[PDB]
Amino acid sequence: KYPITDFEKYLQDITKVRGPMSIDTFIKEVLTNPKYGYYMNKDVFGKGGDFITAPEVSQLFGEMIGIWCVATWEAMGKPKKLQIVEMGPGRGTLMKDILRSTKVFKEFYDSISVHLVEASPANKKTQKQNLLYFKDKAINFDHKTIGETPNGIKVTWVGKLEEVPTDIPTLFLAQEFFDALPIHVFRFSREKNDWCEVLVDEDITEHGEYYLRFVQSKGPTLMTTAVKHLLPEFGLDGYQVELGLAGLAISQQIANRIDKSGGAALIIDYGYDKIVKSSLQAIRDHEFVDILDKPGTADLSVWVDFQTIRKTVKLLKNKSTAIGPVDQGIFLKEMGIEHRLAQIGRKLDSNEKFEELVMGYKKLVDPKEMGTNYKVITICDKNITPIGFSTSKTYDDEDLM
């Protein structure tokens, strides 16, 4: 027990006026509320980024993704203009490593411009400071949405993917992005013989524990009905699933963009090649805590359902498709990470630096590290073979027929 927080008050009040809220709405509020959001106005807490992401683990990761960008661009016939779009670029580390390591490929480097999709002003500032060359002393990062890299590469920031120019071949990079998108949660009731949505309501029950609680909707919600075609038919009592509808919508935007103007997307995240039953987690100061324990004070995340993304793209029945998830270890090895590891190791002269490099490699590719939990899926043109997906599976049930 603890005193009720202001943002818990605020959330309770939403449930009083509009009824229990979907988990999607709950997550949106918790992360991105102007006054109380976790992602918004707080920062300065854990590490300097808090959690180490794949790019921050090793330059190897960024270099392998750069090689993927170049190889893909070649496979698309070396367009004179290529957009590279990143969803949620973090500190800009991945993009920085790409732009460094791909400089050597002149023809490629001459064709690229960069577009970063970023909602957080804090993140925009960090990314700009990390990526741009500045001529002026006084910088207001808000009225500075276009910039130039020290190598002269153009970089533009926008709030939504919708704002990115169309009608130009485009690469899309989404690294640890989908795990941070909101989700809906549904639960099958056999005694109602139908699906219900799981909602967050105020909790005023004696010995309730927190000021919010999870409840089940009285029958199907509008969303339940709207997505019943995605839920499993084998409804067992209490059987529960998570659905990343926001992610599916983004996937459709990317797929249709690729269908119209060409391109390819790499989506890298921790997740499964199946529907995820339960994975929503809340971390605070590097400790797992209850989702409803001081909402807004903890980072929420989900394991990505790669299967539903794949099926959703395929169901567009256009020139796009999604070549199914392959493990990060397998992907990075297939991109030539071991050769690069050897080359960098040889240029290094320090034993300590070499040991660091190898530790990073192992963290990226070992099965007991990120190598298996993290997975890679691509959205691309049916007629252009993806790079790094030789081990992707076939999925008969879902293919053309």
Side-chain angles (χ1 to χ4, degrees):
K1 212 70 225 179
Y2 54 89
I4 193 173
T5 63
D6 290 347
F7 187 30
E8 284 174 313
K9 275 175 197 199
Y10 169 93
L11 292 164
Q12 283 188 323
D13 290 350
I14 296 171
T15 82
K16 292 177 174 206
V17 302
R18 288 184 277 175
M21 72 193 113
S22 70
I23 290 175
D24 180 73
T25 300
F26 174 79
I27 291 170
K28 279 172 189 180
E29 285 279 354
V30 162
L31 301 187
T32 82
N33 177 282
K35 192 161 210 170
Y36 306 101
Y38 179 82
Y39 288 163
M40 305 302 103
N41 52 0
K42 323 282 158 229
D43 303 334
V44 61
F45 250 33
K47 282 203 213 315
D50 253 316
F51 285 137
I52 216 69
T53 51
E56 309 285 354
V57 166
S58 181
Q59 59 171 144
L60 288 178
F61 188 79
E63 294 184 19
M64 290 312 99
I65 302 307
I67 293 167
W68 184 89
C69 289
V70 176
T72 304
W73 168 82
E74 285 175 8
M76 305 176 6
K78 301 179 179 173
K80 292 293 226 312
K81 299 296 179 198
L82 188 69
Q83 291 190 140
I84 299 178
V85 175
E86 186 168 5
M87 313 289 168
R91 297 177 49 81
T93 305
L94 178 64
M95 189 57 69
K96 193 172 191 164
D97 278 305
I98 289 168
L99 294 173
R100 176 184 52 77
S101 70
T102 57
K103 190 184 148 74
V104 301
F105 307 85
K106 280 81 192 156
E107 196 183 348
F108 171 86
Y109 215 67
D110 286 2
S111 71
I112 66 176
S113 64
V114 181
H115 281 81
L116 304 179
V117 185
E118 180 55 64
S120 162
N123 289 346
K124 283 176 202 159
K125 188 179 170 164
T126 297
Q127 291 157 12
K128 285 167 194 173
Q129 285 178 322
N130 194 34
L131 291 170
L132 300 190
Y133 174 99
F134 291 94
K135 304 191 173 281
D136 300 291
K137 212 173 206 288
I139 306 293
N140 183 23
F141 292 89
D142 283 323
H143 56 237
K144 169 85 179 181
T145 66
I146 301 184
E148 213 188 27
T149 270
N151 299 337
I153 297 295
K154 191 168 165 156
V155 186
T156 304
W157 279 262
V158 298
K160 303 190 294 164
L161 180 58
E162 286 89 332
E163 297 165 47
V164 175
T166 60
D167 299 311
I168 304 165
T170 299
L171 294 182
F172 306 84
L173 304 173
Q175 151 68 31
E176 294 182 62
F177 174 78
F178 279 69
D179 70 60
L181 294 175
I183 59 162
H184 296 256
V185 180
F186 304 94
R187 194 201 288 283
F188 189 83
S189 171
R190 193 195 90 266
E191 69 169 25
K192 293 183 290 297
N193 196 44
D194 208 340
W195 289 95
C196 307
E197 188 167 6
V198 178
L199 312 174
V200 179
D201 189 24
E202 72 164 6
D203 188 338
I204 54 176
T205 62
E206 80 192 331
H207 26 272
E209 195 163 27
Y210 302 109
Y211 301 101
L212 297 172
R213 77 206 220 274
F214 294 115
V215 304
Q216 261 202 69
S217 69
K218 295 102 166 60
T221 67
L222 259 288
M223 199 57 94
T224 302
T225 302
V227 307
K228 224 175 171 179
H229 51 92
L230 301 181
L231 297 163
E233 298 174 19
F234 67 95
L236 330 177
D237 192 61
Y239 187 85
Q240 191 167 290
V241 317
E242 301 181 334
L243 236 54
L245 303 198
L248 298 181
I250 287 166
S251 300
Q252 290 173 327
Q253 286 184 54
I254 292 170
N256 289 339
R257 275 182 180 265
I258 289 168
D259 172 75
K260 190 186 189 210
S261 315
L266 255 208
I267 301 173
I268 299 166
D269 225 322
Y270 49 94
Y272 307 99
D273 191 7
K274 62 174 179 179
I275 291 174
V276 181
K277 294 194 205 176
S278 173
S279 78
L280 181 60
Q281 56 178 39
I283 303 169
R284 186 169 58 206
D285 289 320
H286 309 90
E287 293 175 40
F288 282 85
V289 299
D290 282 330
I291 300 158
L292 309 177
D293 177 358
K294 298 175 173 79
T297 66
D299 187 26
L300 301 179
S301 69
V302 156
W303 283 58
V304 178
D305 171 354
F306 286 97
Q307 183 179 95
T308 306
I309 293 175
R310 192 181 64 247
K311 287 183 191 285
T312 293
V313 170
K314 289 179 179 192
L315 280 170
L316 296 169
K317 303 173 169 299
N318 62 31
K319 284 176 289 202
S320 75
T321 187
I323 281 54
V326 306
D327 291 357
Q328 185 172 270
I330 301 308
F331 176 77
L332 294 177
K333 285 173 175 185
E334 196 171 318
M335 297 300 315
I337 193 170
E338 285 163 295
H339 304 128
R340 182 53 57 81
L341 170 62
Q343 284 147 10
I344 292 172
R346 280 153 204 164
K347 291 200 196 72
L348 290 169
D349 224 301
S350 165
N351 203 33
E352 282 101 318
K353 292 177 194 146
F354 183 70
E355 284 195 347
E356 287 173 44
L357 182 66
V358 174
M359 303 259 228
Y361 163 73
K362 284 174 64 177
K363 200 183 165 69
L364 292 169
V365 309
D366 277 11
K368 295 196 193 190
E369 306 290 344
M370 303 191 261
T372 295
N373 292 334
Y374 283 75
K375 304 190 175 56
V376 188
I377 195 177
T378 189
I379 300 178
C380 66
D381 194 290
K382 283 175 170 208
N383 304 311
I384 305 168
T385 310
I387 283 72
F389 291 82
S390 73
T391 65
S392 62
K393 302 185 192 184
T394 301
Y395 323 92
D396 295 339
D397 66 323
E398 60 181 56
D399 262 311
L400 275 356
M401 294 301 292

